[PDB]
Amino acid sequence: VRADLQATALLASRGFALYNAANLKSIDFHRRIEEKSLAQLKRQMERIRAKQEKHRQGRVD
């Protein structure tokens, strides 16, 4: 049991890396999802503005 306990103190650094990697991975996945939403929002607003312009030109004609 002394052996096991001694080993854990050495492999602590690996532990930190494993954890931090997992954190960064989840950060990226969430960030991706948010950017997708913002793209969709902007696409939708372009279709709104397109229709409004067509009807503005219709009134002009």
């Binding site: 052996a3 080993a7 854990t8 050495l10 492999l11 690996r14 494993l18 997992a22």
Partner: protein, 109 residues
């Protein structure tokens, strides 16, 4: 019959708890396998180099292909335990995964 019916629900809870501790479980197993080899070198009296680990979270489990003996048989013993023993293991796993929420629950209690 009620005893056996209750046992079925115990297994359902155990399943949920196992899913609640899944990520922690994987991280642990990577480090347990690494520790197995690490201790061998220490017990020999030699140095623990990077090559020790090279012989071998989720990704690293798949990449590693050095299937170890003892650890696998240990897992079988665990799977082949009684439902009671396994339910209690599930509880310990949950506490040791989310320790922060415990410290907090108790401070407020």
């Amino acid at each position: 019959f009620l005893w056996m019916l209750g046992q079925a629900l115990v297994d359902e809870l155990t399943r949920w708890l196992q899913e609640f501790t899944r990520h922690h479980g994987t991280m642990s197993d990577v480090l347990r396998a690494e520790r197995y080899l690490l201790t061998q070198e220490l017990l020999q009296g030699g140095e623990v180099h990077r090559g020790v680990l090279d012989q071998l979270a989720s990704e690293l489990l798949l990449d590693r292909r050095l299937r170890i003996p003892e650890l696998e048989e240990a897992e079988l013993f665990a799977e082949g335990q009684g439902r009671a023993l396994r339910l209690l293991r599930a509880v310990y796993q949950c506490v040791a995964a989310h320790s922060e929420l415990l410290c907090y629950f108790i401070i407020i209690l």
